[PDB]
Amino acid sequence: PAECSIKVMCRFRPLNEAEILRGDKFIPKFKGEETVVIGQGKPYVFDRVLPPNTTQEQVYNACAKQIVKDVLEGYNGTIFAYGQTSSGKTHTMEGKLHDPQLMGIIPRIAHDIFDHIYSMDENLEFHIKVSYFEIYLDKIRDLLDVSKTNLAVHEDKNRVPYVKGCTERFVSSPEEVMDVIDEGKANRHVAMNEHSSRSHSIFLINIKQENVETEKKLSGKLYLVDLAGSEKNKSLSALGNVISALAEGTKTHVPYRDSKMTRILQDSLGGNCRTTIVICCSPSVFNEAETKSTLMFGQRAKTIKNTVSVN
Numbered sequence: 001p002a003e004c005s006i007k008v009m010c011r012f013r014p015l016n017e018a019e020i021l022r023g024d025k026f027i028p029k030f031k032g033e034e035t036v037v038i039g040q041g042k043p044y045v046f047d048r049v050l051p052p053n054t055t056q057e058q059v060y061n062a063c064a065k066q067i068v069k070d071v072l073e074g075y076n077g078t079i080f081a082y083g084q085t086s087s088g089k090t091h092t093m094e095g096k097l098h099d100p101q102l103m104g105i106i107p108r109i110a111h112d113i114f115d116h117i118y119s120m121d122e123n124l125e126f127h128i129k130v131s132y133f134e135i136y137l138d139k140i141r142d143l144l145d146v147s148k149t150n151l152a153v154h155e156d157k158n159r160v161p162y163v164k165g166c167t168e169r170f171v172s173s174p175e176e177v178m179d180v181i182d183e184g185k186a187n188r189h190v191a192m193n194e195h196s197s198r199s200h201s202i203f204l205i206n207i208k209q210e211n212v213e214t215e216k217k218l219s220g221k222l223y224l225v226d227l228a229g230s231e232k233n234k235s236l237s238a239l240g241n242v243i244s245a246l247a248e249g250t251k252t253h254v255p256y257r258d259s260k261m262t263r264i265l266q267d268s269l270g271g272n273c274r275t276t277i278v279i280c281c282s283p284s285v286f287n288e289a290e291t292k293s294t295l296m297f298g299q300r301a302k303t304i305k306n307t308v309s310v311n
């Protein structure tokens with residue numbers, strides 16, 4: 001039965017040069033470990049607040065660590081990064097893919113996943129399939145086979161959407177999860193900045209396990225989405241409307257089908273999935289306007305209740 005809240009974490013980048021040279025004072029104010037205040041305004045509260053100075057490692061421990069242990073326990077997970085362009089979504093989700101200090105969530109999840117698996121007992125054998133694809137103008141494009149540029153969404157026995165005909169790499173080590181991502185990153189350059197900022201890159205890790213003697217199986221999808229600019233569109237709207245029709249709930253029946261993304265994330269947004277959104281904000285007043293709508297989107301998101309089961 002379970003019933004639990006979409007966690008929501010807030011990560012502010014620091015000021016970059018454009019700003020620091022142009023002056024720019026640091027607008028946001030951090031009280032305790034869960035609350036931020038902008039100027040004289042109302043104070044926002046989230047599951048965590050994560051200033052510029054917090055490390056990748058600590059961002060991981062705060063937002064992701066737990067979602068990993070959920071997937072190994074048979075639950076679906078999903079983390080994603082919402083926010084405006086330049087706000088630090090990719091740094092949080094990916095980071096310097098190969099630096100152990102500067103590496104983001106996906107590589108860390110990769111390592112954490114296999115440290116757990118390696119330590120487990122000989123029976124219960126794991127298969128892990130990953131896939132990597134982006135979205136551009138309501139169209140899915142495979143990052144492991146750039147031949148495929150228009151995959152369709154379908155539904156399983158439980159009437160829940162998945163992407164079909166998606167290349168699948170099989171992995172037995174963190175290092176392979178890395179080369180898969182690197183493949184994808186390369187494939188992209190069969191084209192680019194403007195492109196990336198306005199594509200949604202979705203990285204999917206499917207983990208199936210089976211206790212061999214007892215023959216009982218657990219399973220979970222783990223979506224790790226790096227969303228596009230939510231600034232002032234198409235795909236984010238559906239998500240927002242799909243994230244608006246739920247602070248109230250009741251009889252609304254969310255559009256979901258407004259976009260493929262939402263259709264894929266159906267289960268993440270009011271289904272059998274532990275979901276944790278990371279919202280990324282600039283600390284500059286230049287950007288204040290968007291920072292607030294971001295925060296709105298966040299604050300709203302925390303109201304939603306995922307009903308989750310072991311799968």
Ligand SMILES: Nc1ncnc2c1ncn2[C@@H]1O[C@H](COP(=O)(O)OP(=O)(O)O)[C@@H](O)[C@H]1O
Pocket residue numbers: 012013014051052083084085086087088089090091092197229280
């Ligand atoms: N918490 C942070 N600490 C240090 N640098 C950051 C942080 N967040 C973002 N950056 C910097 O900003 C850039 C990343 O922003 P980006 O991930 O492109 O935003 P988005 O992907 O949301 O458009 C990088 O050059 C990185 O150095």
